[PDB]
Write an enzyme that holds these catalytic residues in place. Structure first.
Site, PDB file in Angstrom:
ATOM      1  CB  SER B  11      -0.839  -0.023   1.289  1.00 40.86           C
ATOM      2  OG  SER B  11      -1.467   1.267   1.464  1.00 40.86           O
ATOM      3  CE  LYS B  43      -9.918  -4.170  -1.790  1.00 39.32           C
ATOM      4  NZ  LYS B  43      -9.162  -4.304  -3.108  1.00 39.32           N
ATOM      5  NE  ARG B  54      -3.392  -4.382  -6.956  1.00 38.13           N
ATOM      6  CZ  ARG B  54      -3.036  -5.508  -6.356  1.00 38.13           C
ATOM      7  NH1 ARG B  54      -2.707  -6.580  -7.073  1.00 38.13           N
ATOM      8  NH2 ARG B  54      -3.012  -5.557  -5.023  1.00 38.13           N
ATOM      9  CB  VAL B 168      -3.687  -0.703   5.038  1.00 42.33           C
ATOM     10  CG1 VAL B 168      -3.981  -1.951   5.933  1.00 42.33           C
ATOM     11  CG2 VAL B 168      -3.472  -1.096   3.544  1.00 42.33           C
ATOM     12  CD1 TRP B 179      -8.029   3.012   5.574  1.00 45.91           C
ATOM     13  CD2 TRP B 179      -9.711   4.227   4.699  1.00 45.91           C
ATOM     14  NE1 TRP B 179      -8.106   2.708   4.210  1.00 45.91           N
ATOM     15  CE2 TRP B 179      -9.140   3.434   3.657  1.00 45.91           C
ATOM     16  CE3 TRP B 179     -10.789   5.058   4.391  1.00 45.91           C
ATOM     17  CZ2 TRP B 179      -9.609   3.463   2.361  1.00 45.91           C
ATOM     18  CZ3 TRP B 179     -11.251   5.069   3.033  1.00 45.91           C
ATOM     19  CH2 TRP B 179     -10.656   4.286   2.061  1.00 45.91           C
ATOM     20  N   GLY B 180      -6.320   6.116   6.633  1.00 49.71           N
ATOM     21  CA  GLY B 180      -5.775   6.949   5.580  1.00 49.71           C
ATOM     22  C   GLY B 180      -4.582   7.762   6.098  1.00 49.71           C
TER      23      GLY B 180
HETATM   24  N1  LIG Z   1      -7.515   8.699   1.144  1.00 53.26           N
HETATM   25  C1  LIG Z   1      -6.549   7.721   1.614  1.00 53.26           C
HETATM   26  C2  LIG Z   1      -6.721   6.372   0.904  1.00 53.26           C
HETATM   27  C3  LIG Z   1      -6.115   5.097   1.471  1.00 53.26           C
HETATM   28  C4  LIG Z   1      -6.371   3.901   0.581  1.00 53.26           C
HETATM   29  O1  LIG Z   1      -6.916   4.059  -0.600  1.00 53.26           O
HETATM   30  N2  LIG Z   1      -6.030   2.671   1.017  1.00 53.26           N
HETATM   31  C5  LIG Z   1      -6.264   1.444   0.289  1.00 53.26           C
HETATM   32  C6  LIG Z   1      -4.967   0.620   0.220  1.00 53.26           C
HETATM   33  S1  LIG Z   1      -3.578   1.570  -0.513  1.00 53.26           S
HETATM   34  C7  LIG Z   1      -7.406   0.711   0.927  1.00 53.26           C
HETATM   35  O2  LIG Z   1      -7.428   0.540   2.302  1.00 53.26           O
HETATM   36  N3  LIG Z   1      -8.387   0.249   0.150  1.00 53.26           N
HETATM   37  C8  LIG Z   1      -9.503  -0.321   0.858  1.00 53.26           C
HETATM   38  C9  LIG Z   1     -10.756   0.485   0.558  1.00 53.26           C
HETATM   39  O3  LIG Z   1     -10.782   1.402  -0.319  1.00 53.26           O
HETATM   40  O4  LIG Z   1     -11.795   0.168   1.205  1.00 53.26           O
HETATM   41  C10 LIG Z   1      -5.243   8.117   2.115  1.00 53.26           C
HETATM   42  O5  LIG Z   1      -4.923   9.222   1.677  1.00 53.26           O
HETATM   43  O6  LIG Z   1      -4.451   7.306   2.728  1.00 53.26           O
HETATM   44  O1  LIG Z   2      -4.672  -3.945  -3.600  1.00 49.89           O
HETATM   45  C1  LIG Z   2      -5.362  -2.910  -3.689  1.00 49.89           C
HETATM   46  O2  LIG Z   2      -6.580  -2.896  -3.398  1.00 49.89           O
HETATM   47  C2  LIG Z   2      -4.735  -1.677  -4.155  1.00 49.89           C
HETATM   48  O3  LIG Z   2      -5.343  -0.962  -4.951  1.00 49.89           O
HETATM   49  C3  LIG Z   2      -3.358  -1.311  -3.615  1.00 49.89           C
HETATM   50  C4  LIG Z   2      -2.638  -0.540  -4.439  1.00 49.89           C
HETATM   51  C5  LIG Z   2      -2.870   0.918  -4.550  1.00 49.89           C
HETATM   52  C6  LIG Z   2      -3.848   1.551  -3.783  1.00 49.89           C
HETATM   53  C7  LIG Z   2      -4.055   2.920  -3.914  1.00 49.89           C
HETATM   54  C8  LIG Z   2      -3.280   3.659  -4.808  1.00 49.89           C
HETATM   55  C9  LIG Z   2      -2.304   3.029  -5.574  1.00 49.89           C
HETATM   56  C10 LIG Z   2      -2.103   1.661  -5.436  1.00 49.89           C
HETATM   57  O4  LIG Z   2      -1.154   1.047  -6.180  1.00 49.89           O
END
Ligand SMILES: N[C@@H](CCC(=O)N[C@@H](CS)C(=O)NCC(=O)O)C(=O)O
Ligand SMILES: O=C(O)C(=O)/C=C\c1ccccc1O
Ligand SMILES: N[C@@H](CCC(=O)N[C@@H](CS)C(=O)NCC(=O)O)C(=O)O
Ligand SMILES: O=C(O)C(=O)/C=C\c1ccccc1O
Lengths: 203, 203
Positions: B11, B43, B54, B168, B179-180
């Site tokens: 991540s 997830k 991604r 995460v 979260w974030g």
């Molecule tokens: N707005 C966030 C986004 C964090 C994020 O997109 N995390 C992903 C992994 S890199 C995640 O937990 N995806 C799960 C979801 O969207 O529910 C930040 O700035 O950290």
């Molecule tokens: O496995 C996932 O769900 C994922 O998108 C992780 C990768 C990621 C998340 C947010 C921004 C860029 C990125 O490569």
């Protein structure tokens, strides 16, 4: 100075972004160009077809907390409406004329739906909003069902998808795009930079 | 003062959160409890089964820009690795002993994968990381393939799901969860409040 703002009335993070943007409009005279668009269409266009955050209870439980935290920071209420059926009110935005009335419509509708928790498909909401804005209730309701109104909504949603918009709230300044109420601090930094260069404080 | 930090080395937003958290650890002595977990499992557990960000090109194009903006704010590089195969390095975290060595492992691995763009499944990465931390390469590699190592990773991922973690980076302080990387400012506010009450500046 012009910011393009893309929102869907179903979006509570858009409610928050609108409140913050409107205070910049009023406090500093920033010009906002408003765009009501169909988040469902924009998601489908980029292939974002999984379950929505609204349908994932564990994540939604957290988002409700995140949303209250921001509402407290901004000093505004945030109350979930009974549904997310925003199409009519989204289309209604295209009845508005100039900036002041466009902004007033967006503010009244967001305050109704996410400030007070009023269902966005409430049958009497168009009349309630018309009374507030000094509009002709029957003219407005007729516009909401018109082919031209839906065409205009479809046109703007399409223009957003062409611009690489994938969600809401989305804001552009020049060539930079930010997505999220939680990125308005970057928008604000960019705006300050341009204010400085235009004042000859920075090259 | 203890913050529980949940991350997956795949991540990039966790990379950013870790950098910020580590500077709080070093600057102010905040205690971090680290938890490497399987984002895919978390997830699946909450039913988040659509396409990942991604896999959505238009949204990923924007996230790459968001990620560079934060990396510039934090004064660190951010370079995408060739894949997201983080399982081995996630499991490897459970070799670390006390706080200092746990933090050093998380920092070295994140810097390698997201600072330099090194593939997290690179066959030589365990040896490279071992050399950096003063570890026994062969002992570490043997741990990475051991049943006990996977058990420990599975245990922590499960404990996270019980705690309502859905993504995460996730951080807890007391009963509050954020979260974030883009919510660490709220964590920091909470931390300041507790520092004040403990200093008798606030009731
Ligand atoms: N707005 C966030 C986004 C964090 C994020 O997109 N995390 C992903 C992994 S890199 C995640 O937990 N995806 C799960 C979801 O969207 O529910 C930040 O700035 O950290
Ligand atoms: O496995 C996932 O769900 C994922 O998108 C992780 C990768 C990621 C998340 C947010 C921004 C860029 C990125 O490569
Ligand atoms: N971190 C954001 C999140 C904004 C958000 O989740 N927006 C939703 C609609 S309310 C969205 O655009 N979903 C599309 C997506 O996740 O790709 C913020 O604080 O505003
Ligand atoms: O239609 C959607 O995709 C959606 O989740 C909109 C609703 C929403 C988003 C984020 C937080 C709360 C919420 O109700």
């Amino acid at each position: 100075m012009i910011v393009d703002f893309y929102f869907d009335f179903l979006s509570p993070f858009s409610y928050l972004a609108n409140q913050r943007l409107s205070k910049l409009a009023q406090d500093y005279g920033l010009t906002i160009r408003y765009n009501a668009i169909d988040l469902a269409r924009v998601k489908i266009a980029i292939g974002n077809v999984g379950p929505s955050n609204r349908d994932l209870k564990v994540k939604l439980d957290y988002l409700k907390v995140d949303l209250q935290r921001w509402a407290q920071l901004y000093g505004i209420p945030l109350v979930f409406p009974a549904n997310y059926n925003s199409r009519r009110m989204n289309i209604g935005f295209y009845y508005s004329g100039a900036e002041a009335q466009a902004a007033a419509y967006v503010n009244v509708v967001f305050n109704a739906v996410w400030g007070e928790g009023i269902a966005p498909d409430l049958e009497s909401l168009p009349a309630l909003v018309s009374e507030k804005l000094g509009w002709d209730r029957s003219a407005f309701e007729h516009f909401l069902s018109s082919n031209a109104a839906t065409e205009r909504y479809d046109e703007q949603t399409h223009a957003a998808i062409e611009r690489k918009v994938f969600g809401v709230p989305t804001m552009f300044l020049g060539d930079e795009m930010w997505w999220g109420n939680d990125r308005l601090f970057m928008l604000e930094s960019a705006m300050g930079r341009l204010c400085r260069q235009n004042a000859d404080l920075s090259s």
